[PDB]
Scaffold this motif. Structure first.
Motif, PDB file in Angstrom:
ATOM      1  N   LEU A 235       0.750  -1.290   0.230  1.00 13.82           N
ATOM      2  CA  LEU A 235       0.489  -0.354  -0.036  1.00 13.82           C
ATOM      3  C   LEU A 235       0.588   1.427   0.004  1.00 13.82           C
ATOM      4  CD1 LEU A 235      -3.044  -0.778   1.955  1.00 13.82           C
ATOM      5  CD2 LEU A 235      -3.156   0.376  -0.064  1.00 13.82           C
ATOM      6  N   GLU A 236       1.927   1.119   1.204  1.00 13.55           N
ATOM      7  CA  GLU A 236       2.748   2.340   0.822  1.00 13.55           C
ATOM      8  C   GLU A 236       3.489   2.460  -0.860  1.00 13.55           C
ATOM      9  OE1 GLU A 236       4.803   3.174   4.733  1.00 13.55           O
ATOM     10  OE2 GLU A 236       2.811   4.278   5.230  1.00 13.55           O
ATOM     11  N   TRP A 237       3.725   1.485  -0.479  1.00 12.28           N
ATOM     12  CA  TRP A 237       4.351   1.447  -1.913  1.00 12.28           C
ATOM     13  C   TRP A 237       3.126   2.579  -3.244  1.00 12.28           C
ATOM     14  CZ3 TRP A 237       2.529  -0.755  -6.478  1.00 12.28           C
ATOM     15  CH2 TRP A 237       3.895  -0.941  -7.378  1.00 12.28           C
ATOM     16  N   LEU A 238       2.314   1.843  -3.144  1.00  8.84           N
ATOM     17  CA  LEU A 238       1.277   2.225  -4.316  1.00  8.84           C
ATOM     18  C   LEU A 238       0.674   3.733  -4.238  1.00  8.84           C
ATOM     19  CD1 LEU A 238      -0.911   1.695  -5.964  1.00  8.84           C
ATOM     20  CD2 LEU A 238      -0.392  -0.493  -5.555  1.00  8.84           C
ATOM     21  N   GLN A 239       1.125   4.249  -2.874  1.00 10.57           N
ATOM     22  CA  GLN A 239       0.793   5.442  -2.992  1.00 10.57           C
ATOM     23  C   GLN A 239       2.366   5.649  -2.987  1.00 10.57           C
ATOM     24  OE1 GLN A 239      -1.858   7.558  -0.404  1.00 10.57           O
ATOM     25  NE2 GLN A 239      -2.032   6.409   0.973  1.00 10.57           N
ATOM     26  N   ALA A 240       2.922   5.741  -2.685  1.00  8.09           N
ATOM     27  CA  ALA A 240       4.870   5.810  -3.391  1.00  8.09           C
ATOM     28  C   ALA A 240       4.723   6.242  -5.190  1.00  8.09           C
ATOM     29  CB  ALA A 240       5.839   5.030  -2.318  1.00  8.09           C
ATOM     30  N   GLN A 241       4.299   5.155  -5.759  1.00  7.63           N
ATOM     31  CA  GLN A 241       3.749   5.443  -6.643  1.00  7.63           C
ATOM     32  C   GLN A 241       3.632   6.304  -7.914  1.00  7.63           C
ATOM     33  OE1 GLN A 241       5.445   2.301  -7.946  1.00  7.63           O
ATOM     34  NE2 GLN A 241       5.708   2.834  -5.623  1.00  7.63           N
ATOM     35  N   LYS A 242       3.516   6.971  -8.427  1.00  9.34           N
ATOM     36  CA  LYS A 242       3.539   8.196  -9.379  1.00  9.34           C
ATOM     37  C   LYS A 242       2.957   8.002 -10.086  1.00  9.34           C
ATOM     38  CE  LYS A 242       6.036  11.425 -11.448  1.00  9.34           C
ATOM     39  NZ  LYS A 242       5.486  12.078 -12.895  1.00  9.34           N
ATOM     40  N   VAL A 243       2.407   6.507 -10.885  1.00  7.54           N
ATOM     41  CA  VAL A 243       1.551   5.839 -12.085  1.00  7.54           C
ATOM     42  C   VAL A 243      -0.501   6.739 -11.327  1.00  7.54           C
ATOM     43  CG1 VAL A 243       1.822   3.917 -10.485  1.00  7.54           C
ATOM     44  CG2 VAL A 243       0.660   3.924 -13.275  1.00  7.54           C
ATOM     45  N   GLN A 244      -1.416   6.319 -12.336  1.00  6.83           N
ATOM     46  CA  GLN A 244      -1.728   7.118 -11.907  1.00  6.83           C
ATOM     47  C   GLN A 244      -3.686   5.332 -11.664  1.00  6.83           C
ATOM     48  OE1 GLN A 244      -1.357   9.974 -13.681  1.00  6.83           O
ATOM     49  NE2 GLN A 244      -2.376  11.252 -12.645  1.00  6.83           N
ATOM     50  N   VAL A 245      -4.334   5.174 -11.018  1.00 13.59           N
ATOM     51  CA  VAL A 245      -4.528   4.120 -11.420  1.00 13.59           C
ATOM     52  C   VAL A 245      -6.187   5.489 -11.451  1.00 13.59           C
ATOM     53  CG1 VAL A 245      -3.630   1.868 -10.714  1.00 13.59           C
ATOM     54  CG2 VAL A 245      -3.538   3.568  -9.161  1.00 13.59           C
ATOM     55  N   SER A 246      -6.990   4.259 -12.643  1.00 10.97           N
ATOM     56  CA  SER A 246      -8.870   4.399 -12.460  1.00 10.97           C
ATOM     57  C   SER A 246      -9.727   3.489 -10.816  1.00 10.97           C
ATOM     58  CB  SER A 246      -9.141   3.691 -13.508  1.00 10.97           C
ATOM     59  OG  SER A 246      -9.293   5.214 -14.779  1.00 10.97           O
ATOM     60  N   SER A 247      -8.590   2.601 -10.939  1.00 13.68           N
ATOM     61  CA  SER A 247      -9.569   1.624 -10.072  1.00 13.68           C
ATOM     62  C   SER A 247      -8.189   0.861  -9.109  1.00 13.68           C
ATOM     63  CB  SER A 247     -10.244   0.675 -10.675  1.00 13.68           C
ATOM     64  OG  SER A 247     -11.215   1.220 -11.203  1.00 13.68           O
ATOM     65  N   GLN A 248      -8.358   1.048  -7.680  1.00 17.19           N
ATOM     66  CA  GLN A 248      -6.764   0.663  -6.853  1.00 17.19           C
ATOM     67  C   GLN A 248      -6.868  -0.969  -7.487  1.00 17.19           C
ATOM     68  OE1 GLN A 248      -6.545   0.091  -2.454  1.00 17.19           O
ATOM     69  NE2 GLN A 248      -6.156   3.160  -2.894  1.00 17.19           N
ATOM     70  N   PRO A 249      -5.971  -1.185  -7.559  1.00 22.67           N
ATOM     71  CA  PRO A 249      -5.118  -2.670  -7.957  1.00 22.67           C
ATOM     72  C   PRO A 249      -5.687  -3.526  -6.820  1.00 22.67           C
ATOM     73  CG  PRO A 249      -3.355  -1.694  -8.253  1.00 22.67           C
ATOM     74  CD  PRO A 249      -3.871  -0.942  -7.171  1.00 22.67           C
ATOM     75  N   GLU A 250      -5.474  -4.908  -6.737  1.00 30.44           N
ATOM     76  CA  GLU A 250      -5.821  -5.652  -5.674  1.00 30.44           C
ATOM     77  C   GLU A 250      -4.406  -6.327  -5.074  1.00 30.44           C
ATOM     78  OE1 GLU A 250      -7.777  -8.083  -3.563  1.00 30.44           O
ATOM     79  OE2 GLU A 250      -8.478  -5.539  -3.684  1.00 30.44           O
ATOM     80  N   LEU A 251      -4.105  -6.998  -3.756  1.00 33.17           N
ATOM     81  CA  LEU A 251      -2.627  -6.477  -2.735  1.00 33.17           C
ATOM     82  C   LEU A 251      -3.035  -8.318  -2.315  1.00 33.17           C
ATOM     83  CD1 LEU A 251      -2.464  -3.556  -1.608  1.00 33.17           C
ATOM     84  CD2 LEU A 251      -3.111  -3.903  -3.971  1.00 33.17           C
ATOM     85  N   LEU A 252      -2.252  -8.911  -2.459  1.00 35.16           N
ATOM     86  CA  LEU A 252      -2.459 -10.712  -2.815  1.00 35.16           C
ATOM     87  C   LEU A 252      -0.964 -11.202  -2.297  1.00 35.16           C
ATOM     88  CD1 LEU A 252      -4.914 -11.401  -5.767  1.00 35.16           C
ATOM     89  CD2 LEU A 252      -5.322 -10.308  -3.419  1.00 35.16           C
ATOM     90  N   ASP A 253      -0.672 -12.148  -1.684  1.00 30.66           N
ATOM     91  CA  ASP A 253       0.632 -12.472  -2.110  1.00 30.66           C
ATOM     92  C   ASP A 253       1.242 -13.175  -2.429  1.00 30.66           C
ATOM     93  OD1 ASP A 253       3.081 -12.998  -0.309  1.00 30.66           O
ATOM     94  OD2 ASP A 253       2.128 -13.313   1.722  1.00 30.66           O
ATOM     95  N   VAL A 254       2.256 -13.878  -2.692  1.00 32.25           N
ATOM     96  CA  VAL A 254       2.866 -14.604  -4.412  1.00 32.25           C
ATOM     97  C   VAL A 254       2.328 -15.765  -3.687  1.00 32.25           C
ATOM     98  CG1 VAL A 254       4.871 -13.305  -4.549  1.00 32.25           C
ATOM     99  CG2 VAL A 254       4.602 -15.056  -2.407  1.00 32.25           C
ATOM    100  N   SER A 255       1.828 -16.106  -2.696  1.00 30.85           N
ATOM    101  CA  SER A 255       1.123 -17.413  -3.096  1.00 30.85           C
ATOM    102  C   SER A 255      -0.504 -17.406  -4.020  1.00 30.85           C
ATOM    103  CB  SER A 255       0.508 -17.160  -1.534  1.00 30.85           C
ATOM    104  OG  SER A 255      -1.081 -17.283  -1.638  1.00 30.85           O
ATOM    105  N   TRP A 256      -0.893 -16.295  -3.581  1.00 33.34           N
ATOM    106  CA  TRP A 256      -1.652 -16.622  -5.323  1.00 33.34           C
ATOM    107  C   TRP A 256      -1.116 -16.303  -6.602  1.00 33.34           C
ATOM    108  CZ3 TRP A 256      -3.412 -12.480  -8.708  1.00 33.34           C
ATOM    109  CH2 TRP A 256      -4.388 -12.399  -9.392  1.00 33.34           C
ATOM    110  N   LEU A 257       0.050 -15.452  -6.530  1.00 29.97           N
ATOM    111  CA  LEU A 257       0.458 -15.639  -8.157  1.00 29.97           C
ATOM    112  C   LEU A 257       0.936 -17.271  -8.227  1.00 29.97           C
ATOM    113  CD1 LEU A 257       3.061 -14.843 -10.194  1.00 29.97           C
ATOM    114  CD2 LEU A 257       0.839 -14.429 -10.324  1.00 29.97           C
ATOM    115  N   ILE A 258       1.363 -17.720  -6.972  1.00 35.28           N
ATOM    116  CA  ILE A 258       2.078 -19.319  -7.151  1.00 35.28           C
ATOM    117  C   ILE A 258       0.689 -19.965  -8.236  1.00 35.28           C
ATOM    118  CG2 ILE A 258       3.467 -20.733  -5.745  1.00 35.28           C
ATOM    119  CD1 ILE A 258       4.309 -18.651  -4.116  1.00 35.28           C
TER     120      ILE A 258
END
Length: 120
Positions: free
Chosen positions: A74-97
């Motif tokens: 999250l903190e990183w999300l806000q740190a980003q400079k890119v503008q998102v129309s809809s906040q992305p989902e935050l999941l652990d690699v366990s998801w990607l895995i």
């Protein structure tokens, strides 16, 4: 003067160039991982048909982060400079895995989710 020939070719399990999901952008976070894996997993997911991105974008609908907590991301999300129309989902690699071994966007019962501003 000019000349050329060029060539073409394609072979795969019914998928020459059609992202399985046209709304499943997964963004792996290097922080707490590295490049190898980050790129690897990112490449592995793609192979599945997922739309992984090397850089964050407004298309990013799901952000993967290993170890890192929903807060860190999250903190990183806000740190980003890119503008998102809809906040992305935050999941652990366990998801990607899993999303990989599942070849699909596994369900998010929470365990997959890192954290969110959920009170009630």
């Amino acid at each position: 003067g000019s000349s050329g020939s060029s060539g073409t070719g394609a072979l795969m399990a019914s998928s020459p160039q059609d992202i399985k999901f046209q709304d499943l952008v997964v963004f792996i976070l290097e922080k707490k991982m590295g490049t190898t894996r980050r790129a690897l997993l990112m490449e592995l997911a793609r192979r599945k048909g997922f739309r992984v991105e090397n850089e964050l974008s407004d298309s990013v609908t799901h952000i993967v982060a290993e170890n890192n907590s929903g807060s860190d991301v999250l903190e990183w999300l806000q740190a980003q400079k890119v503008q998102v129309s809809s906040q992305p989902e935050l999941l652990d690699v366990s998801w990607l895995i899993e999303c990989i071994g599942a070849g699909k966007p596994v369900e998010m019962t929470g365990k997959h989710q890192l954290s969110g501003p959920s009170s009630g």
